[PDB]
């Protein structure tokens, strides 16, 4: 619930950033707005790349840390570690 709320607020603010970026530069805007052009499932898939160090997701480190802590707690409950 709250993870999705924060992610949506993130994308709301990123949309304002890229909409200024469009008025600054139109040619570069493609890569800015690709993750808005993508279907929602693809958007979730690109946004949920916190794992490992590929780290091409545009999400901030604090939001990454929230999911990482939740995943560690879930693994601890599951008994993996």
């Amino acid at each position: 619930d709250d993870f999705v709320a924060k992610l949506q607020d993130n994308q709301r603010f990123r949309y304002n950033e890229v909409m200024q970026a469009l008025n600054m530069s139109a040619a570069l805007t493609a890569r800015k707005t690709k993750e808005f052009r993508s279907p929602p499932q693809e958007q979730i898939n690109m946004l949920l790349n916190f794992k490992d160090d590929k780290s091409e997701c545009p999400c901030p480190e604090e939001i990454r840390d929230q999911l990482l802590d939740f995943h560690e707690d879930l693994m601890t409950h599951c008994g993996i570690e």
Partner: peptide, 19 residues
Amino acid sequence: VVACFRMAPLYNLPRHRAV
């Protein structure tokens, strides 16, 4: 082409679908 650039985002998406 701005219309083609702008598609459906999660922030416009409702809560439960995004969940």
